[PDB]
Amino acid sequence: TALVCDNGSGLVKAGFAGDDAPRAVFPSIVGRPRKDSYVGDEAQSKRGILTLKYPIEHGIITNWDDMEKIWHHTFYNELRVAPEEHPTLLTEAPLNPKANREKMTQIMFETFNVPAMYVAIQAVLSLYASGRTTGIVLDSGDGVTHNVPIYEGYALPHAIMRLDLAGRDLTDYLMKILTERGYSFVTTAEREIVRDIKEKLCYVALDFENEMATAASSSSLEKSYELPDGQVITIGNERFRCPETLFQPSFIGMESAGIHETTYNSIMKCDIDIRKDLYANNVMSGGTTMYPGIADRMQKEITALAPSTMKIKIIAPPERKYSVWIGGSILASLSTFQQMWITKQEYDEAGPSIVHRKCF
Amino acid sequence: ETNEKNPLPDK
Amino acid sequence: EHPEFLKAGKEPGLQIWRVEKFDLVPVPTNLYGDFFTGDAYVILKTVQLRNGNLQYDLHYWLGNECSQDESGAAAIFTVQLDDYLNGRAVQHREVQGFESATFLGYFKSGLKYKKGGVASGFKHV
Ligand SMILES: Nc1ncnc2c1ncn2[C@@H]1O[C@H](COP(=O)(O)OP(=O)(O)OP(=O)(O)O)[C@@H](O)[C@H]1O
Numbered sequence: 001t002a003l004v005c006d007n008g009s010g011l012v013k014a015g016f017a018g019d020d021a022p023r024a025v026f027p028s029i030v031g032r033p034r035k036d037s038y039v040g041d042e043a044q045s046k047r048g049i050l051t052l053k054y055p056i057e058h059g060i061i062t063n064w065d066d067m068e069k070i071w072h073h074t075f076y077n078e079l080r081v082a083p084e085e086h087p088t089l090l091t092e093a094p095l096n097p098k099a100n101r102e103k104m105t106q107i108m109f110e111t112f113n114v115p116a117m118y119v120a121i122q123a124v125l126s127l128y129a130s131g132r133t134t135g136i137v138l139d140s141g142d143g144v145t146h147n148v149p150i151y152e153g154y155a156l157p158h159a160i161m162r163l164d165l166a167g168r169d170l171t172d173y174l175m176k177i178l179t180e181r182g183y184s185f186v187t188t189a190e191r192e193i194v195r196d197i198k199e200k201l202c203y204v205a206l207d208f209e210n211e212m213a214t215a216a217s218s219s220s221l222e223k224s225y226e227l228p229d230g231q232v233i234t235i236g237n238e239r240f241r242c243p244e245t246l247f248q249p250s251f252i253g254m255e256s257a258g259i260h261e262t263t264y265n266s267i268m269k270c271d272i273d274i275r276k277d278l279y280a281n282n283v284m285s286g287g288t289t290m291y292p293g294i295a296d297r298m299q300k301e302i303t304a305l306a307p308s309t310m311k312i313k314i315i316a317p318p319e320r321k322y323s324v325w326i327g328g329s330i331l332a333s334l335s336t337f338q339q340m341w342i343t344k345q346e347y348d349e350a351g352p353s354i355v356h357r358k359c360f
Numbered sequence: 361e362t363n364e365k366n367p368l369p370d371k
Numbered sequence: 372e373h374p375e376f377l378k379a380g381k382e383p384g385l386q387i388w389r390v391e392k393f394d395l396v397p398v399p400t401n402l403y404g405d406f407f408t409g410d411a412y413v414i415l416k417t418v419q420l421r422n423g424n425l426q427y428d429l430h431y432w433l434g435n436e437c438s439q440d441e442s443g444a445a446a447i448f449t450v451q452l453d454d455y456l457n458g459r460a461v462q463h464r465e466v467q468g469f470e471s472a473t474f475l476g477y478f479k480s481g482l483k484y485k486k487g488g489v490a491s492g493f494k495h496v
């Protein structure tokens with residue numbers, strides 16, 4: 001049975017084609033003491049003796065020796081398979097460098113000896129999982145945010161927007177403003193505690209200025225969080241100020257337009273004839289789109305930017321942390337996908353550049 | 361059954 | 372290569388397939404227009420053009436209760452069918468209760484719904 005591996009800046013999502021969910025989800029980290037190395041959940045717990053490295057940054061693989069360790073860990077420790085037995089669908093970021101696609105292909109065939117493989121674009125898989133062939137995906141993870149317009153099954157490369165503001169930046173900012181509130185979150189161990197606060201307590205305000213005034217004239221927007229040591233801390237307007245950064249990147253000294261503006265800019269780089277279908281099919285995917293209120297806020301913000309007669313629809317599936325993986329699971333399972341794999345034989349005859357002809 | 365293997369550090 | 376692709380868009384007319392556990396399965400011609408709301412379907416309408424060429428409209432119909440694997444598969448099959456037909460098909464997403472006038476017009480006796488359908492192809496994990 002085919003394997004599906006969705007490698008992210010922060011998390012690896014791995015499983016079997018035909019399952020409704022990944023079997024394994026773990027941090028894309030390699031830890032070394034300074035046993036040579038530890039990968040994933042093992043590296044997290046042993047951080048007292050380990051220095052941690054992330055092989056993927058902003059969606060792009062930049063450390064290929066550590067990435068091989070991630071993949072070995074996926075095959076042997078998590079999925080517990082013999083790689084040589086299983087066709088392997090991998091995912092890539094939009095606009096992933098051509099040499100990266102080739103390197104990925106080379107490693108799979110030459111290091112792991114897979115019988116077949118395929119590389120799919122993450123945002124496109126997410127659109128498929130939503131039961132659409134046309135739309136614009138807002139994919140936001142731990143390391144990167146993209147706007148990816150897609151028409152009749154294929155991304156429009158010229159109109160893709162990249163934003164190097166995502167979950168890790170939000171976590172760092174929450175650390176800063178919680179520090180300002182009197183607490184001390186600065187170390188890497190403490191980063192993960194603040195990430196949990198972010199995931200449990202943060203939300204996107206429908207109207208930001210109104211929310212600030214509510215938090216200033218009430219305490220009903222305040223929440224408590226129990227630290228590991230037992231200390232109960234309070235979170236006030238930081239709850240919505242953190243993710244507001246997505247809409248106002250100036251909050252962290254960035255000159256970039258916020259996610260609503262990049263969405264509009266992306267749509268506007270497309271043919272006027274398809275924009276209507278883009279506006280009606282805004283699909284959110286990735287962990288950083290999980291904030292309560294984000295879909296309603298995006299609806300409001302894009303409505304304000306679009307022509308007043310445009311039908312705007314934000315689709316935010318509850319399962320959208322795994323949408324990319326699920327799309328891959330469906331794709332790999334289709335009776336019509338059997339001929340679409342790059343086989344080991346095809347790789348032997350053509351070399352790594354086959355990926356550019358077999359995988360859009 | 362998905363196992364998300366990402367535990368938080370203790371004191 | 373898929374046997375149903377080889378059959379697709381050869382002559383003028385209506386062709387309907389149902390997504391059944393990650394496969395495209397032809398719907399019996401006598402049952403055209405009776406849609407299971409627990410299911411997803413792919414519809415190809417082939418029209419003879421005066422210029423000798425064939426016109427293609429691909430509609431993927433999504434039932435209110437169809438599972439994610441089925442709606443996902445219907446969307447992908449549509450893309451693949453379109454590519455197989457040299458990109459010449461126009462793709463249409465059709466949702467139960469919100470189908471286009473042109474889609475509804477394909478069914479001379481009128482499109483109808485029934486509850487139920489084939490089980491999901493997903494393994495729950
Ligand atoms: N409920 C939640 N609210 C806010 N953020 C969340 C929530 N759940 C997860 N996240 C964040 O989403 C990110 C992980 O999501 P995802 O797996 O899509 O990213 P990735 O694929 O690792 O990174 P990228 O796609 O940027 O390469 C983390 O930053 C995590 O803190």
Ligand SMILES: [Ca+2]
Pocket residue numbers: 007008009122141286324
């Ligand atoms: Ca991702």
Ligand SMILES: [Ca+2]
Pocket residue numbers: 409410411436437438441487488489490491
């Ligand atoms: Ca069904």
Ligand SMILES: [Ca+2]
Pocket residue numbers: 152453458459460461462
């Ligand atoms: Ca087409």
